[PDB]
Amino acid sequence: SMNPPPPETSNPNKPKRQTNQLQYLLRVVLKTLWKHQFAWPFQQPVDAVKLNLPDYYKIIKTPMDMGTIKKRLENNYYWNAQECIQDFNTMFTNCYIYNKPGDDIVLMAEALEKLFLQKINELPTEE
Numbered sequence: 001s002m003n004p005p006p007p008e009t010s011n012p013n014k015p016k017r018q019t020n021q022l023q024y025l026l027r028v029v030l031k032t033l034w035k036h037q038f039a040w041p042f043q044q045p046v047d048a049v050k051l052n053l054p055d056y057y058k059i060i061k062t063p064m065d066m067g068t069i070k071k072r073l074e075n076n077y078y079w080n081a082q083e084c085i086q087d088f089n090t091m092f093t094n095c096y097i098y099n100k101p102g103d104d105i106v107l108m109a110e111a112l113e114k115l116f117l118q119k120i121n122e123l124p125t126e127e
């Protein structure tokens, strides 16, 4: 029923870094997806109470959303690009797992992912 606490977006005991790749992830990748017309359902954790989806957090045990990702990048939560790329993949994967292959939300995720894969194809090599 109730929503779980959201994923953490800072942690005093987790080592922080900024790499040119993480800068690219925030400035080009996140920026491009965030502003997209299909971004809004992904800009914050799935609110399963408000959506009336009691099974969401019985099914999805590794939630992720772009709001969480944006804050992680802003806080320099990550050590490397892979951690961030992983968060995006988890977000898309959760969507494809919970929802049916027809669904608008799935089609939305697919277009965002297609864009994601384009931008990530041009990730710079490290400075």
Ligand SMILES: Cc1noc(C)c1-c1ccc2c(c1)[C@H](OCCO)N(C)C(=O)N2
Residues within 6 Å of the ligand: 041, 042, 046, 047, 051, 053, 094, 095, 098, 099, 104, 105
């Ligand atoms: C993301 C995600 N992954 O699995 C689910 C379910 C979502 C999701 C999150 C928020 C919303 C919706 C779906 C839903 O559909 C949005 C597209 O119609 N809706 C009507 C809405 O108001 N917000």
